Design a protein around this ligand. Structure first.
Ligand code: 8W7
Ligand code: ZN
Ligand code: ZN
Lengths: 1132, 381, 29
């Protein structure tokens, strides 16, 4: 009884693994990046990274290695998901279709076993003989690699060693050999085994066990001619090869331990290393030793290169460029230049890929346009901490406003030869054409001599030979720049009226009645070149020259009013190069041909609000490319404004859109506007590179924001941000941040780097008295004030020593008209375990200064804080306290409620309160206003790790729990038994695949009443650790049932990578139990219905009984669901 | 404040007999299952799994029942009576038989038996048999186990930084306030990705809670390091729950908790926030000093012992206890401590039977310094 | 003497009956 719909509004961005190899082709070098559920394939070029394929899998990529078995032209790919779904993929392309086929697949989990605390390790023989996997302690799962092993059948081998740290296959061995470092009560040792496939058991290793440093972490296998393994610890790096043994203890690497590595030379002569604090090392091996041709290691030099992002995984591309893949910061492409050495750093950043993870908190705010919200996240950690502002579509920033009574057409004009700047805007009404003049910011209306004042102007723009062509309704009367006299006037021979006008640089083709006459723009003349008649009425005409020449349009496509068909015909002739009958009924509204990024298209916009995009051939004929997008519900007029060094097209309709090309395919964005009827680019002197958009009620001039569907702006802080809240009265953001300061040998603290908290315009230090060794690092917590316009840190309040700021809320209390910044802190000491005392402090940003209005000392940790109908609801330890703000500017307690659980999470919906803890102990309260004490309604205790809460409705509650799941609880107040009304039934399960940190109410799409409203009620955003934004909305029963039928039907049609069943992945997963997902609709799968071919859409629809409109229409057609899924796509 | 006494005789239950018929425990329910298990009446005590119960059998019907159980699955169902009497109970524990003797003496039936709990259950119905021994509906309650709280958000790269070296030595100043700081800093290193601090995640850690409870147990009295304290959190939680001097409602609430971490948190809160003990009738008693609770046994401060005639009293051993009076002589034929002599200790105000005073019998011990209480009239406040 | 009087609920021992009866009524209620 939940009926929720979860969709991904922004795909995950954090990188958790990257490999290189000849995957797509034996000649190309690929960089494969796995974000989480998404696998991205790049091709490295001279400039940088060129994307090739973007494919998402039904799991969390946990192991990803490229191997080339003997007899294969290019490398294969082995992927193991978090649910133990192993698969082997091959890249295949046929001209233009790209598909990643699944060569082998299977499930490699065991019936019983405790998962290892170190995690999944996936290693492959260098000779490609088997795949080893360590999934459970005390067991090593070996997968034989054979052409006949299509189901990936594996056999377990017993490890006598319980705790294995890292394991890797050794290079240059006749028999397969592993070399692992493992833990004992006597310390850490390195051991080796010879895996035998015929015997299905281990053997004696090549070289005996050697005691290593007690902090050894990783094992790296050094290829030939070196051989052996290098073991990197927290203080020393050693090289074990049996007879050979060398070790160093460099002093550079002792600040932080190396966490990841990558080889840069094919023979293993140099290595890359990275640590937690994010600096790049370079381990150098010297092979100067050569006795009789044999090459052996002699020296183990280490050098420091520079400082990069906090790298989760490294990768060395060709020609000295290194991909520093970060998981809590922006990914990077650094360059290992050798001879610059600007100040002691060998690395220079080339690129920087956006990464929103981890998201710790977010708030939805309408920063620019009222009604449309924006997302401000707290992304990153340590020096990677920052704020990200996310908005949808390309906004228009208005710079002028003029009242125009329904202008039926806007065209630019340049009444100044040799000026290179527009001066007047030709606004055309139903019967009149007013030429508004604006040299600067004026709104004058200076009529041109050559332009008819009272005439329905259809086109008025500059023509060749310094002439201005004005093809009005009466006749196509030309003009000139200097003399301003009619050089030519091509009146209708039959005194007819022009219906469609299309004037180009050299040609001017107009249509009167059913006959179209093409008149070339002769020098100081109007000479016809061809004439023809159409079978039906000409709905629209489009004569636009393509690339090059720009003096003669190869084709001139026209629309038929009575036939609703588009035909492309040559300009100097009448033969139809191609014919298309896309759509019907409603007549076409506007025809246009574009050249987005050396790709030619011919877009036809019907009058029903659908755009029929289709490619075209410049030489002869045109393509079909049948694809319709409902870009609004009103007739659309297409205009082309470059404004980007790219063609671009503006779709003026009820919902404006800009059609741009991302890589090679047109992408449709949104313009954050109510309604634009006509648009025209005006490069005026007073409004340079502007875009005068004329609505149905007024005319405005502005500039576009960008050409991207999602725009993310980064405001770096160089410190970890925790919580964010928006104070609209003060127009500022309150951000809690904490920086690491090291305890030096002087009794004080010195910052590691200049942060956003030590570089504020003003500063303060909390001075309240209601209350080790050198090298130790402590956290200093601050409350920042960030401007809502410039995003500069206005203030930075610093809390007391050993005080942890946990909660932050911005609200007004009682009858006080001021809005306050209220912070709940907890004084923590290493000596004790559960905090004994904490403070509730109330700030106020007024006149650019932060002052403490009142502070309250409580005996506990203030875990969470909300506003409760003008009263403050604090959560001290395991008690929920209600505070009232008096007229003395002081808080007094009013209601206490001593729970048996510690109230981490607080939510409020009217008079209801939702309380939970990390143990997924959801508990609900209800405040009696007449009696003044909290009373409990329902309970739901279930031992599990819970990550977030949210109140979807008065009786539905959402949350995230262990194994990246989502659940919905619902109370049944209609039950007549008292034992049931005090229980929260679980009516929803789902395996999201992400660790949800924060739940927020709001949406990034503008909310309008819309009469018909929306098939989905409400909208809740959530941000995860990987840096993806979700969106969950409620559904109706019938709509949910139809969507579930669609979901079950799609699984039989679409092909997944790895042949992983969809129901298996989405089934609620936990280390002790599993069950199918119920009450949740996979939004991604449903929205993937638009991406399949027409025959697949036809096979999907057989009996879906779509006619829920009191009937059935069993057939249900195929365009009925397209309307249904479009509304589901418009919500984000 | 230490006496040369071995803390193994009271646990051995030698006052029953010496040539005990030891039976090997090789039983287990299949987990989450409907079951039917007989119940012995005339017992009013909540039994926690792992706790040893000493029972005395007098009536012929119950002796026949226990003999039949011996020639059957050696498990009965100890019922957990609530505040309301007349079999108004909802929970219980399965106790396994591992010792049986006759010791006829007077010789009617006479059975010596010791039982230890193994599993919990919730009873659905209480069926009464005409024989006199009732068999009730049993649904086995599984014991929930949870993984590490950071495994969900853990980084794959820094998973090698998860196997810590062994704890250096044990119970030393600045050898624990620093090693535990290092363990907290390195284990919950990924708490920065989430929205909660490291100490909050350490509040729900099993190992930290066990260490805190061990420190408190040492605070009560000197504990021999790993003095039979199990490493597994489930077993440690059950042992601590058995050794806590709390009333019936607190014990049944602890039994209702299904996860080890929640049980440890509840036990720690109980032993950190409850200090005052009451004398039921009386307003309060000198026993309010919880800091003087000793434990003269391996099992802990409390264990179950049976008197000569059927009834079983679990006792609390404390260092000092005022507000009491002595009636009778220091008898010694049935003291639960072999090297001690027992005396009837009566209350001084409400005169309700609680406690037994003990007198000196040997040299290397505590002369006239001993007290053994009971849950007859002691409640925590 | 052998004093057969003996409390069964608590286990208190008496050489007479009055205190045994008092203790029995104490156990009662
Ligand atoms: O440390 C302590 C503290 C005191 C505690 N006691 C003494 C006691 C009795 O003490 C008199 C007595 C002693 C011995 C018997 C012998 N039986 C055995 C079988 O039934 C018939 C004959 C009967 C009565 C009699 C009954 C109950 C208790 C009771 O709770 C105890 O036992 N151990
Ligand atoms: Zn008393
Ligand atoms: Zn008595």
């Amino acid at each position: 009884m939940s009926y929720n719909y979860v969709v991904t509004a922004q795909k995950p961005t954090a990188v958790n693994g990257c490999v290189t190899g000849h995957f797509t082709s034996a000649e190309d070098l690929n960089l494969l990046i796995a974000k989480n559920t998404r696998l991205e394939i790049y091709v490295v070029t001279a400039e940088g990274l060129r994307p090739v394929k973007e494919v998402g899998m039904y799991g969390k990529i946990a192991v990803m290695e490229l191997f080339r078995p003997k007899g294969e032209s290019k490398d294969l790919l082995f992927i193991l998901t978090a649910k133990y779904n192993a698969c082997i993929l091959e890249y295949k392309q046929s001209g233009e279709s790209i598909d990643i086929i699944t060569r082998a697949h299977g499930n490699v989990q065991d019936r019983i076993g405790r998962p290892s605390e170190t995690g999944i390790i996936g290693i492959i023989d260098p000779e490609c003989r088997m795949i080893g996997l360590r999934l459970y302690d005390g067991l090593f799962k070996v997968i034989p690699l054979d052409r006949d092993n299509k189901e990936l059948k594996a056999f377990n081998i017993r490890l006598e060693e319980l705790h294995v740290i890292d394991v890797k296959f050794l290079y240059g061995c006749q028999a397969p050999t592993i070399c692992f470092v493992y833990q004992d009560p006597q310390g850490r040792h390195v051991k080796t085994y010879e895996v035998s496939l015929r015997e299905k058991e281990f053997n004696k290793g090549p070289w005996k066990q050697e005691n290593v440093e007690a902090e050894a972490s990783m094992v790296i296998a050094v290829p030939e001619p070196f051989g052996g393994a290098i073991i990197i610890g927290q203080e020393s790096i050693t090289y074990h090869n049996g007879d050979k043994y060398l070790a160093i203890a460099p002093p550079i690497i002792k600040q932080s331990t190396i966490v990841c590595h990558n080889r840069v030379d094919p023979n293993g002569s140099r290595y890359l290393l990275g640590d937690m604090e994010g600096r790049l090392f370079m381990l150098l091996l010297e092979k100067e030793e050569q006795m009789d041709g044999t090459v052996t290691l002699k020296d183990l030099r280490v050098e420091l290169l520079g400082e990069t992002s906090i790298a989760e995984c490294l990768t060395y591309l060709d020609n000295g460029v290194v991909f520093v893949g970060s998981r809590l910061g922006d990914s990077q492409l650094v360059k290992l230049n050798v001879d610059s050495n600007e100040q002691g750093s060998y690395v220079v950043a080339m690129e920087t890929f956006t990464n929103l993870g981890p998201i710790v908190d977010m708030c939805v705010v309408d920063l620019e346009r009222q009604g449309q919200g924006q997302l401000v996240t707290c992304s990153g950690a340590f020096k990677e901490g920052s704020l990200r502002i996310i908005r949808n579509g390309i906004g228009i920033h208005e710079h002028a406003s003029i009242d125009l009574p329904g202008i039926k057409g806007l065209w630019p004009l340049r009444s100044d030869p040799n000026r290179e700047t527009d001066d007047t805007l030709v606004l055309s009404f139903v019967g009149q054409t007013r030429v508004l003049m604006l040299n600067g910011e004026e709104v004058e209306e200076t009529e041109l001599m050559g332009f008819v004042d009272d005439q329905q102007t259809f086109f008025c723009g500059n023509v060749a030979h310094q002439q201005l062509i004005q093809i009005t309704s009466a006749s196509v009367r030309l003009v000139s720049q200097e003399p301003k006299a009619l050089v030519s006037e091509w009146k209708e021979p039959q005194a007819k009226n022009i219906s469609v006008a299309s004037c180009n640089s050299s040609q001017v083709v107009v249509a009167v009645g059913r006959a179209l006459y093409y008149l070339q723009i002769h020098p100081q003349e109007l000479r016809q070149i061809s004439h023809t008649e159409m079978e039906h009425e000409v709905a629209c005409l489009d004569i636009t020259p393509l690339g090059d020449s720009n003096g003669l349009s190869p084709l001139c496509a026209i629309g038929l009013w009575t036939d609703i068909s588009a035909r492309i015909l040559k300009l100097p002739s009448f033969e139809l190069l191609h014919k298309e009958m896309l759509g019907g009924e409603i007549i076409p509204r506007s025809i246009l041909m574009t050249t987005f990024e050396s790709s030619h298209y011919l877009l036809c916009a019907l009058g029903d609000g659908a755009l029929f995009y289709f490619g075209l051939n410049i030489e002869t004929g045109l393509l079909s490319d049948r694809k319709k997008v409902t870009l609004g519900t009103q007739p659309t007029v297409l205009r082309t404004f470059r404004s980007l060094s790219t063609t671009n097209v503006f779709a003026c309709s009820d919902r404006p859109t800009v059609i741009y090309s991302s890589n090679h395919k047109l992408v449709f964005s949104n313009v954050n506007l109510k309604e634009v009827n006509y648009m025209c680019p005006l490069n005026s002197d007073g409004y340079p590179d502007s875009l005068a958009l004329a609505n149905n009620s007024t005319l405005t001039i502005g500039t576009i924001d960008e050409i991207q569907k999602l725009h993310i702006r980064t405001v770096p802080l160089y410190e970890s941000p925790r919580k964010i809240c928006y104070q609209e009265v003060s127009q500022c953001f309150g951000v809690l941040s904490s920086r690491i300061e090291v305890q030096d040998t002087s009794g004080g603290t010195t910052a590691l780097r200049p942060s956003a908290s030590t570089q504020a315009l003003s500063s303060s230090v909390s001075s309240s008295k209601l209350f080790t060794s050198f090298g130790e690092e402590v956290e200093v917590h601050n409350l920042l004030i960030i401007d809502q316009h410039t995003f500069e840190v206005l203030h930075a309040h610093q809390f007391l020593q050993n005080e942890y700021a946990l909660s932050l809320v911005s609200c007004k209390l009682g009858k006080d008209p001021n809005t306050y910044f209220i912070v709940g802190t907890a004084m923590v000491y290493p000596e004790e375990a559960e905090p004994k005392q904490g403070r509730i402090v109330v700030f106020q940003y007024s006149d650019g200064k932060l002052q403490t209005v009142a502070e309250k000392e409580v005996k506990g940790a203030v875990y969470s804080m909300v506003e409760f109908n003008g009263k403050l609801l604090a959560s001290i330890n395991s008690t929920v306290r209600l505070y009232e703000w008096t007229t003395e500017k002081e808080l007094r307690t009013e209601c206490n409620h001593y729970n048996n659980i510690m109230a981490l999470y607080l939510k409020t919906k009217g008079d209801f309160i939702l309380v939970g803890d990390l143990m997924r102990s959801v508990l609900l309260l209800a405040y009696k206003p007449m009696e003044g004490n909290f009373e409990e309604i329902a309970r739901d205790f279930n031992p599990n790790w819970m990550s977030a809460v949210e109140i979807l409705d008065d009786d539905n509650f959402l949350g995230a729990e262990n194994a990246f799941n989502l659940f919905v609880c619902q109370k049944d107040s209609a039950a007549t038994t008292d034992e049931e009304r005090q229980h929260l039934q679980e009516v929803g399960l789902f395996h999201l695949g992400e660790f949800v940190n924060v739940f927020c109410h709001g949406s990034l799409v503008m909310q309008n009443l819309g009469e018909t409203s929306t098939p989905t009620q409400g909208s809740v955003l959530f941000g995860t650790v990987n840096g993806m934004i979700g969106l969950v909305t409620s559904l109706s029963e019938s709509w949910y049932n139809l969507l579930l039928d669609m979901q079950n039907r799609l699984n039989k049609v679409i092909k997944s990578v790895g042949k992983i069943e969809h129901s298996f992945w989405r089934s609620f997963h936990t280390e002790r139990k599993t069950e199918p997902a119920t009450g949740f609709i996979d939004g991604d799968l449903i929205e993937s219905f638009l991406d399949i071919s027409r025959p697949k859409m036809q096979e999907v629809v057989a009996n879906l009984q779509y006619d829920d409109g009191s009937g059935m229409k069993r057939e249900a057609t195929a365009d009925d669901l397209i309307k249904v899924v479009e509304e589901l796509t418009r919500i984000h | 404040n230490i006496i040369n006494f071995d803390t193994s005789l009271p646990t051995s239950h030698t006052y029953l007999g010496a040539d005990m018929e030891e039976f090997h425990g090789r039983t287990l329910h299949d987990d989450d299952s409907c079951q039917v298990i007989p119940v012995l009446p005339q017992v009013m005590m909540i039994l926690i799994p792992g706790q040893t119960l000493p029972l005395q059998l007098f009536h012929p019907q119950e002796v026949s029942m226990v003999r039949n159980l011996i020639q059957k699955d050696r498990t009965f169902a100890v019922l957990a009576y609530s505040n309301v009497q007349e079999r108004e109970a909802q929970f219980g524990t399965t106790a396994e038989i591992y010792a049986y003797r006759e010791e006829q003496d007077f010789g009617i039936e006479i059975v010596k038996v010791k039982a230890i709990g193994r599993q919990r259950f919730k009873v659905l119905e209480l069926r009464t048999q005409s024989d006199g021994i009732q068999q009730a509906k049993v649904q086995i309650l599984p014991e929930c186990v949870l993984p590490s709280t950071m495994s969900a958000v853990q980084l794959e790269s820094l998973n090698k930084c998860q196997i810590f070296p062994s704890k250096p030595v044990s119970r030393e100043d600045q050898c624990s306030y620093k090693w535990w700081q290092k363990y907290q800093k390195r284990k919950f290193h990924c708490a920065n990705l989430t929205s909660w601090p490291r100490w909050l995640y350490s509040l729900y850690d099993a190992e930290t809670l066990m260490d805190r409870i061990k420190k408190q147990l040492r605070e009560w009295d000197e504990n021999l390091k790993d003095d039979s304290l199990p490493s597994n959190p489930i077993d440690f939680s059950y042992r601590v729950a058995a050794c806590l001097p709390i009333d019936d409602v607190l014990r049944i609430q602890l039994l209702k908790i299904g996860s080890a971490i929640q049980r440890l948190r509840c036990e720690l809160d109980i032993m950190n926030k409850c200090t005052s003990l009451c004398c039921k009738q009386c307003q309060e008693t000198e026993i309010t000093t919880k800091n003087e609770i000793f434990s003269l046994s391996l099992c802990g401060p409390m264990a179950a012992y049976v008197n000569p005639h059927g009834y079983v009293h679990e006792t609390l051993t404390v260092y000092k206890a005022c507000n009491l009076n002595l009636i009778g002589r220091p008898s010694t034929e049935h003291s639960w401590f072999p090297g001690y002599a027992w005396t009837v200790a009566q209350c001084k105000i409400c005169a309700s039977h609680i406690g037994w005073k003990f007198t000196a019998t040997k040299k290397d011990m505590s002369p006239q310094k001993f007290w053994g209480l009971t849950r007859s009239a002691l409640l925590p406040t | 003497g052998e004093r057969p009087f003996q409390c069964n609920q608590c286990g208190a021992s008496f050489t007479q009956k009055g205190n045994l009866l008092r203790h029995i009524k104490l156990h009662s209620g």
